[PDB]
Design a protein around this ligand. Sequence first.
Ligand SMILES: [Mg+2]
Ligand SMILES: [Mg+2]
Ligand SMILES: [Mg+2]
Ligand SMILES: [Mg+2]
Ligand SMILES: [Mg+2]
Ligand SMILES: [Mg+2]
Ligand SMILES: [Mg+2]
Ligand SMILES: [Mg+2]
Ligand SMILES: [Mg+2]
Ligand SMILES: [Mg+2]
Ligand SMILES: [Mg+2]
Ligand SMILES: [Mg+2]
Ligand SMILES: [Mg+2]
Ligand SMILES: [Mg+2]
Ligand SMILES: [Mg+2]
Ligand SMILES: [Mg+2]
Ligand SMILES: [Mg+2]
Ligand SMILES: [Mg+2]
Ligand SMILES: [Mg+2]
Ligand SMILES: [Mg+2]
Ligand SMILES: [Mg+2]
Ligand SMILES: [Mg+2]
Ligand SMILES: [Mg+2]
Ligand SMILES: [Mg+2]
Ligand SMILES: [Mg+2]
Ligand SMILES: [Mg+2]
Ligand SMILES: [Mg+2]
Ligand SMILES: [Mg+2]
Ligand SMILES: [Mg+2]
Lengths: 59, 118, 113, 205
Amino acid sequence: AKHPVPKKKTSKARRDARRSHHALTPPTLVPCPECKAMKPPHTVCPECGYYAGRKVLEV
Amino acid sequence: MRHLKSGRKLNRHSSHRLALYRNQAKSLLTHGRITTTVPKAKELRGFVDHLIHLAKRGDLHARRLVLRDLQDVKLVRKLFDEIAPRYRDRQGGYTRVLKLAERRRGDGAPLALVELVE
Amino acid sequence: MEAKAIARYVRISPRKVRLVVDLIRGKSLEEARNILRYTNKRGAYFVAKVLESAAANAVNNHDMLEDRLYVKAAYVDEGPALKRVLPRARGRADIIKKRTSHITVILGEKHGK
Amino acid sequence: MKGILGVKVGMTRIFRDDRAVPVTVILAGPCPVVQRRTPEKDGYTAVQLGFLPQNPKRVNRPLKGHFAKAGVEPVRILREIRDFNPEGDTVTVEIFKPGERVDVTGTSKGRGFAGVMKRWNFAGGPDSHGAHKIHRHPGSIGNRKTPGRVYKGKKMAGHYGAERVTVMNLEVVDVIPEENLLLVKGAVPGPNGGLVIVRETKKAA
RNA sequence: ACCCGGUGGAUGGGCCGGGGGUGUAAGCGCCGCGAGGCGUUGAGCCGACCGGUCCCAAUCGUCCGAGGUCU
RNA sequence: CGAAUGCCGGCAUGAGUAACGAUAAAGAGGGUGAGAAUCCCUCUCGCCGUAAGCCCAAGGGUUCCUACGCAAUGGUCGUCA
RNA sequence: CCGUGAGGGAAAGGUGAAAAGAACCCCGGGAGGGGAGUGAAAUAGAGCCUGAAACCGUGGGCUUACAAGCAGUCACGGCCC
Ligand SMILES: [Mg+2]
Ligand SMILES: [Mg+2]
Ligand SMILES: [Mg+2]
Ligand SMILES: [Mg+2]
Ligand SMILES: [Mg+2]
Ligand SMILES: [Mg+2]
Ligand SMILES: [Mg+2]
Ligand SMILES: [Mg+2]
Ligand SMILES: [Mg+2]
Ligand SMILES: [Mg+2]
Ligand SMILES: [Mg+2]
Ligand SMILES: [Mg+2]
Ligand SMILES: [Mg+2]
Ligand SMILES: [Mg+2]
Ligand SMILES: [Mg+2]
Ligand SMILES: [Mg+2]
Ligand SMILES: [Mg+2]
Ligand SMILES: [Mg+2]
Ligand SMILES: [Mg+2]
Ligand SMILES: [Mg+2]
Ligand SMILES: [Mg+2]
Ligand SMILES: [Mg+2]
Ligand SMILES: [Mg+2]
Ligand SMILES: [Mg+2]
Ligand SMILES: [Mg+2]
Ligand SMILES: [Mg+2]
Ligand SMILES: [Mg+2]
Ligand SMILES: [Mg+2]
Ligand SMILES: [Mg+2]
């Protein structure tokens, strides 16, 4: 509401033509070492995922 | 630029950012394991390690230079008499950092874990 | 056979949700299930809930061998909005409209061939 | 036209006939000619070179150990020299006798998104008197209804630095063939460790 | 985006050595009624620079990706 | 009825953009919970302190206290109010 | 509801013939669905007759990344029905 303003109502085309990028990507997942559960890499997985320094397990 | 500089600015100013670390420290050396944002941790290492290494060499001057950051006699005590030991034959990395796979909700902050190795 | 599970009037803005309802269209309910669990978006949650619900309907009502069905179709629809008032500077006042979604998630049976 | 590659050690003033100062140590390590692009099979004349040896095998396939000199292929064979034809094997460093003149070509320092007035030295605004949130702006950029556009080359802010830059006629102060070392006259681009190349001065020769 | 690493590895953090910046820490001893001064001591502390070192972390894996139209 | 910067209603565009209301400031552990950066507890840190603390008057009119609860209200969250 | 006040002054009607208003089971904290059941009819399910248009979608056919655009029209050509 002021100085610069939209000259024309953008076309439905150009609108979605710019959102051609907002397309969301799928996470990056990998199988946990032990439990046959799926989980994102380099992370002390939500099911006892890791060895040595406590793996904040589900025990 | 703002090239070869090293040392996260944590959307905090001097006295805050500093007094922040001293509080991460006190926690970490009382509970042995703390959970924070991955970054807030990646920094905590060196601040603590130092505190600990100053503990091994542990004499009087070390007891004090260390106290300056913890202010608490006890704990400062528990660190020199029960923590320092466990590391006397370990040179470096007296601290660990392990990323968590879940993010704080209604915020979405990537988390991590911090425990004293060994 | 197929089984749907529509979550009506979910207080949340469509364009925000369609985002994820797009991450699981046509996938292994095992795949989907996973993706959602690990997707940083309020929407994830709501879609999951529905998804997991048609999963149940699949089993319980239409006999479908859980471990053999995918997301044949999914898609969220626009529901009546909530016109609230947002006071502005110089006695302006505006109508902020809290939208609401209608999330549909229908299931189908994978090959078996 | 003598080529050669080298990182860029550091800087430091020296001393010669009193009149101290002022060089840029840079090492033109052994550069194993790994190809010699012919004006028949290629159309022009040059010599792929290769630098830093290394690579205990990060070297995929292509590699090109073909030319029996590809000693565990260098990290950056990057670049040939052009109109250069060595002693068909490894460029010395002694290709340079002191007193000679050169040209260093390097990757300049990366200044990211740079405001105008660094990127171009624009005068900026007036720190006081009127002022008002234009203390560092580019001021005006065009005329009115005619032209009604902005010049194809109109200076403005943007990526600035981290571009291939060449500084010429640099005097070759010295050279230690033992350590592949080479000393010049400060004016040499890029950061330390970044790669640079050293030709013979285009000034004449 | 680009570039370099990812343990058959010195990538970052710690640690050690060196640069470098401060100006000779605390404790103790001595001199002074005392503020102080002297010594131990160029000490102590010490970001970013140059290196060394697997003590901490780059674990484990996953997904893409040609099989070449016609005279 | 196609135009009146027409009237009423509805839905678009700018746009996932500007914002989210003092730069006094946060950190962690443990609870509860279907669900916690946001609720309870404890330790640490910071802010006001001729108030950012207390007592009156006006005005307000149940906002007080307690039990059970989150659709909406709270500029996010909410098990809290 | 607006205004100190005189005064201004809205929006908002319809399930079915009869509540027969959806037992019970399943997912879910709920809301909400899926079955089941009522009904002639359930896109008659209570933010309920008919439910148009803007506007937001999902799927399919044709089409498009060397192209200059009041967006049509007139020709030929492919592809789909
Ligand atoms: Mg930096
Ligand atoms: Mg201060
Ligand atoms: Mg006002
Ligand atoms: Mg830079
Ligand atoms: Mg000026
Ligand atoms: Mg100003
Ligand atoms: Mg003008
Ligand atoms: Mg390292
Ligand atoms: Mg040192
Ligand atoms: Mg002393
Ligand atoms: Mg080694
Ligand atoms: Mg007319
Ligand atoms: Mg209108
Ligand atoms: Mg914009
Ligand atoms: Mg912006
Ligand atoms: Mg913003
Ligand atoms: Mg606020
Ligand atoms: Mg009340
Ligand atoms: Mg109360
Ligand atoms: Mg809320
Ligand atoms: Mg508000
Ligand atoms: Mg609760
Ligand atoms: Mg309560
Ligand atoms: Mg039902
Ligand atoms: Mg009807
Ligand atoms: Mg009727
Ligand atoms: Mg109707
Ligand atoms: Mg074409
Ligand atoms: Mg035409």
